[PDB]
């Protein structure tokens, strides 16, 4: 199979097809069944090394996006058993590093950040245009990691019935390489400054939104190069109640954070060739409930 | 042609094209001149051989289009030349159809 | 003529090429190409000589000549499969050889044949 | 638990896997009227007309024809009940000959056929296969129209003695001339139209 080790690889909503992307310059795809699997494809195209892809929601169907070093994002849609290259964007000065789909409640818009110091957000009508939402000086240096708003999370919606549809304000988070993290809300047609966060005196590497189903509060696991893992939490941003807590003091450059598809636990890639499996215990504290030696 | 030597003219042309030599842009004019012979009531016309002529013509025009655009000049007469080429091949088809008709009416 | 042509043997005359020439007379490229292609079909079903191979080559040749005339909004043909035809008029009935299964009208047992497919076929021929 | 959600889920499942029967069934069952409309128009109409499986989409269009469904879908009137009309006329004319015919439905045949001739024009095909099914429809309607115009003078109960009536092509032509026609059977149709215009012009204005 792949000529270079895998950064990212994602199964579907249905567990029956797997996309696997390396910096090995191409991305290969298996059908998944019975425990067996046939490599159905190996999509080429990416004239920069590949890191990340992005699947979309099932009520839309089957949609993938990908970033590369060549400042190209390639956009793949599956037909008749054939995934193929549907939209592709470039115009970027530095390698496009972060791509992530928005909740289908907000729609078919991908977020696209790069260490350019600035970030675009691209909408696909699904048949039509690719609406561009480009924000310059988003960083004074560059963008490392970005996360959306997950669309629905407790805190004020208990009194809001299931029959109606609530207002969908757009917000999100990210952290860059100017030693800072930042928080954004969308209005006036554009995005403005929820929050500035300066606690990691070094560059932040990865960011983790706790899928706050059951949580009125807003919960962040921020991992930087400086070995400090901050759980940032605010019950209310309007009363400005974001506070840092230590999750773990790893002595390695702290790398990756990703919540479960089951939205229960967090996987943290450490400078140990390991992925620590942490769960916020039922009581009050964050316990590394398991590990995977990479 | 100039002394209207239809039989041996056509035989030579058949032999030459079966020899399969020279660039396409000129086989254009080749069959352009072959036109009135094809028009004339002649029984030696082997329509099937005429049609490897035309299928090679298709092959060559496809290759010509792939290798270059027939008209890189935008003028009132470039589209004239093009549509003239399609009309030419349409004339090829229609004249061959007539020749087949005459051949059959003579096979009686 | 089709009543006669189906009823009589093909080796006496190609009434199919006869009708094809009529098609040419009447400027009907669709029907002409279909006739010549189906006569190639009949030859392929019936005979297996290399002369016959040249013959189906000519058949498919002429059909795609009609293709040279066909308008893009019609780039396809129908072809239904059916049973055999009577042979030896003036002789006893039930004279049937080889043959093909009959189709089903309340469905689509017919085959629609377009540019690229038929040129695949002629290239292989 | 309301089967609305289960039909939603198995419907998107089917839209993933490609089981035509199942997407159609569960789209009907959950009544996504507009999108089910649009998808059936895209695919299912041609499928059923060319494969002659009128039963299923017959029930389909029948339940869709309910006026409230017409209210929640744009352009139901444009196509769906139109093809429902096609198929209904086809079946009833078939059965009227499956028994001994009665003019009390033959007159309705004439009235609705010559009318819907006026709206065959407004058929809009945005696909090659859509226009192909349109062509198949046109050729079949020409065939059945020839058959019925021949048989409306039944072989033992002739309607008119020997009269050659004036053809309603004076109304048919301005609308039938608005669509193209394949020269395969356009030949015979156009020839019949030739002798029609001959008498029409020898007896013109």
From Swiss-Prot, chain B:
It comes from the Eukaryota. It is found in: Nucleus, Nuclear pore complex; Nucleus membrane. Component of the nuclear pore complex (NPC). Component of the nuclear pore complex (NPC) that seems to be required for NPC assembly and maintenance. Involved in nephrogenesis. Belongs to the nucleoporin Nup85 family. This is Nuclear pore complex protein Nup85. It comes from Xenopus laevis. The gene is nup85.
